[PDB]
């Protein structure tokens, strides 16, 4: 959920969540599921990747809420 520090196995299991979330999202877009679930599962796909630390695909500097710390459970 939010656990470990520089565990390789923990990163593999996290990357599994990223993969499976991203595959499920791809499926949902295909499956004509609720668009309202899709964007929520896509926001979870964003949140999780934003814990891994994604590649710098051009600069952004989009601001955020004041240290919101959106965990889950």
Structure method = NMR
Q: The domain containing residue 62 runs over which residues?
A: 1-73
40/21 Cα distance (integer angstroms): 11
Give the total number of structural domains in the chain: 1
- The tokens describing 70, both together, are 């959106």
Look at phi and psi of residue 20 and say left if phi exceeds 0, alpha if psi is from -120 to 50, else beta. Answer: alpha
Q: Which of 13, 7, 4, 17 is nearest to 48 (CA)?
A: 17
Both ends of the chain: CA-CA distance in Å? Answer: 7
Are the CB atoms for 6 and 52 separated by under 8 Å? no
* Angle subtended by helix axes 8-30 and 35-52, to nearest 10: 160
Which residues make Cβ contacts (< 8 Å) with residue 25, sequence separation at least 6? 38, 41, 42, 45
């Amino acid at each position: 959920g939010s656990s470990g520090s520089s565990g390789m196995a923990e990163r593999a299991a996290l990357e599994e969540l990223v993969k499976l979330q991203g595959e499920r999202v791809r499926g949902l877009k295909q499956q004509k599921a609720s668009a309202e679930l899709i964007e929520e599962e896509v926001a979870k796909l964003l949140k999780l990747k934003a814990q891994l630390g994604p590649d710098e695909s051009k600069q952004k500097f989009v601001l955020k809420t004041p240290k919101s710390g959106p965990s889950s459970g």
